[PDB]
Nucleic acid binder design. Sequence first.
DNA 1: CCGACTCGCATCAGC
DNA 2: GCTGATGCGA
DNA 3: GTCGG
Length: 326
Amino acid sequence: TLNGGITDMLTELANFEKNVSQAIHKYNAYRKAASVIAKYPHKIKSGAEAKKLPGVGTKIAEKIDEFLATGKLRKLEKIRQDDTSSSINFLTRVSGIGPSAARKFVDEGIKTLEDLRKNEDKLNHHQRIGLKYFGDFEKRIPREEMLQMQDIVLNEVKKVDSEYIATVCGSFRRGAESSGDMDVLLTHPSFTSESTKQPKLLHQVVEQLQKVHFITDTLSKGETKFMGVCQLPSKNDEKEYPHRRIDIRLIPKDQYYCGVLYFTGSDIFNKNMRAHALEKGFTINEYTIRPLGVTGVAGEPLPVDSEKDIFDYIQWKYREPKDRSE
DNA sequence: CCGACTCGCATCAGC
DNA sequence: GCTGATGCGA
DNA sequence: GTCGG
Ligand SMILES: Cc1cn([C@H]2C[C@H](O)[C@@H](COP(=O)(O)NP(=O)(O)OP(=O)(O)O)O2)c(=O)[nH]c1=O
Ligand SMILES: [Mg+2]
Ligand SMILES: [Mg+2]
Ligand code: NA
Ligand code: NA
């Protein structure tokens, strides 16, 4: 990271606009600029140099020049001193508490960690578990642990039905040396885009993982998406592993490649690829890639037989998962 | 100059 | 209960 | 906040 200081500054500004200003497009603007600078293979010398990159306009160019000259940003220094901003930015770090709820909690005088802990009855379920594992959820997961978790999930899933296929995506599939959480794609031949020949396909998997005490908590749970908490087993006299966030996503089996492309990421890579898809006259979700008729409505799903096919349509060279970490 | 920047689950308002 | 919007998150 | 039209 040749420009770590610059990208940190931009990320912190992105978090401000998202959590405090509640301006999601400014959040995305700052995160795009941070991303494009992160992969820039030179140590940036000026805001003008950075301005040539796509996503870096005039305003960010000015802030880069201020940072390079002084090592600080006065706009950020003020934001850090603001109490409401500081309180909201902290509260939103609890999973389940977004910008809206964070601002509402502050109005009611709930703005610290002990505040949250004494007002548990004013949290919904997701928020209560997010508070419960606040410390754990901010810890990274070494790939070594990710490999153990993959081993458990894939085997427990096989025990339920051998026709399941569990694929670990996210930063792990991109080959990250450490991950923020675990992301699992799930397929079963009974569930396709044409029909669902078996009920509770995701349920049975979740229940099995609970049965062996891998899954410990549930944030949300529906037909196709599970969002919860898991933990590795520790041997005798060991300090326990931290509790980890786990997402499980059931996708129609015939729509695997669109699914695995989506969940592999990164999130900014997905935004860029889908934006590029639009400019090429296609639209992409986790299910399909569809053309746009000039009238502006999506047409019928095009044939997809690999991840590369999706790249081919929008005229991108194929990029390995390890080169999608934007 | 300025419109525009994919979806699942929880929860709530309105009927 | 159903529908559609909002919040939050992947 | 940025940018393509
Ligand atoms: C947050 C987010 C995620 N995704 C997709 C891309 C991610 O790689 C995938 C899993 O989300 P994640 O676990 O929050 N991101 P990650 O696995 O790439 O990185 P890490 O968990 O922080 O290590 O979901 C989106 O398509 N839009 C999003 O806004
Ligand atoms: Mg992840
Ligand atoms: Mg995740
Ligand atoms: Na630029
Ligand atoms: Na949060």
